[PDB]
Amino acid sequence: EVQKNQVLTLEEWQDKWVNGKTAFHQEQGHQLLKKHLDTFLKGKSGLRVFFPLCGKAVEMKWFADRGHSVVGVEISELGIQEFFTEQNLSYSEEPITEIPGTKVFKSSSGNISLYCCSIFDLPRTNIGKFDMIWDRGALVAINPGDRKCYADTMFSLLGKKFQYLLCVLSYDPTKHPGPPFYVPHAEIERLFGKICNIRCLEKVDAFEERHKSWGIDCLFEKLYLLTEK
Numbered sequence: 001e002v003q004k005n006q007v008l009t010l011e012e013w014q015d016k017w018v019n020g021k022t023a024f025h026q027e028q029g030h031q032l033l034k035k036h037l038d039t040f041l042k043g044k045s046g047l048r049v050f051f052p053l054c055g056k057a058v059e060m061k062w063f064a065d066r067g068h069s070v071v072g073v074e075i076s077e078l079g080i081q082e083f084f085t086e087q088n089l090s091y092s093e094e095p096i097t098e099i100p101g102t103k104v105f106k107s108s109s110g111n112i113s114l115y116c117c118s119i120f121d122l123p124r125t126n127i128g129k130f131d132m133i134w135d136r137g138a139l140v141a142i143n144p145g146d147r148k149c150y151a152d153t154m155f156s157l158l159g160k161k162f163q164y165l166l167c168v169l170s171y172d173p174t175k176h177p178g179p180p181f182y183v184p185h186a187e188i189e190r191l192f193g194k195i196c197n198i199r200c201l202e203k204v205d206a207f208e209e210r211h212k213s214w215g216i217d218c219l220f221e222k223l224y225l226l227t228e229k
């Protein structure tokens, strides 16, 4: 409960993009996902995959290239345009009618749609249900107090059977206030334990030189696989 009162605003996240402060972005993609990708998609085709707080995650293309439909939500229009530019994809726009002033960016390929609004606006849209969710730099970027609402929101997006892939970071919360925030095993059990079977697939050192700016000297990444209980 040390970071419990941290409250970031959407304007602050949008400013990080405008100012180029996006060190969370991994150009080569998540290595743990890469390792387990073939197993998670074994025997499946044409899945609908959701990427909350997607930024310009290259992993979205990995799924689209394998025949799966991808939907993401990101508050920064700049981040979304950077995704299309870097993946060399053309796109067109459409209004999100239920949330005046916002838009959804759709690739010409028809395989990727990026909603440019808040994840908390989604329940009021017709985004529908998903077979799979890839959550990295998402549950851990959400204001601590908003996590229960975030979890409830995610559940309303899931189909009967699903695979919720979740990445969280393990570090001493008294040394760095976040983001990304500290989401311990207990918090995952509190937020998802009633509805999901929880499996911790991997735990690996993720400390990089850039992390010294956080004031920590230790950093571990854990990959969880949550499925219908």
Ligand SMILES: Nc1ncnc2c1ncn2[C@@H]1O[C@H](CSCC[C@H](N)C(=O)O)[C@@H](O)[C@H]1O
Residues within 6 Å of the ligand: 010, 013, 014, 024, 025, 026, 052, 053, 054, 055, 056, 057, 073, 074, 075, 076, 079, 117, 118, 119, 120, 136, 137, 138, 141
């Ligand atoms: N409430 C909210 N709704 C939608 N997007 C949000 C949001 N709060 C933060 N974001 C966006 O959340 C992202 C978190 S960092 C994103 C990283 C991306 N998932 C990756 O793995 O590289 C930022 O791009 C930020 O602009």
